[PDB]
Amino acid sequence: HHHHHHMVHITLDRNTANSWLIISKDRRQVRMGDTHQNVSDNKERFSNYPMVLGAQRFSSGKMYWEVDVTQKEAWDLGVCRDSVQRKGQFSLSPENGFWTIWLWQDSYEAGTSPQTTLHIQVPPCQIGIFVDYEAGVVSFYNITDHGSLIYTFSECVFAGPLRPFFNVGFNYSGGNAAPLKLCPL
Ligand SMILES: CC(C)N(C)c1ncnc2c1cnn2C
Ligand SMILES: CC(C)N(C)c1ncnc2c1cnn2C
16 A cells, blocks of 8 residues: 555543553553553543543544554454444444454454454554545555555545544453554654
């Protein structure tokens, strides 16, 4: 792909984070803590899952960023509406304001409803995410495999400002402690 020149500097918004997440000083990394991280509750925090938003809001233009997923067993990545539900249980789909892919139980899927199987020969260590607001497109790229296309959501109906979306996943197995990291431009 040739989307690299739309690179944007994403930082994580602490206030949206589930209370067990640990966000680094530079706001560029996030991991699952082994306990509540001693923060006060607020209406922005994702309560039920290990999720956090980027601070940046996008309402026009073309945007690109990269995320490191090295050695993780489970995670979700993409974008979401600024007004997605924070509390309780919910489906990760465009109907609920999410445009995402994930890894779970050794397979990759796109968060359509129902979910779509992805075809990945080279497990990615870094994922590229491209958003074209005007076109209604969200695309995902395998940086480990020379930028090959993973998935394109087209005909997107964003219906609001978009925020970068992250889920570090649970660590029930003891094999999913590694962080998500925003990769340098
Ligand atoms: C098969 C569906 C319902 N599950 C379990 C999931 N869907 C999307 N992201 C997920 C999971 C599990 N972990 N993460 C990060
Ligand atoms: C929001 C949902 C899709 N997420 C991230 C989930 N994560 C982990 N386990 C899950 C789910 C859903 N069901 N189950 C059993």
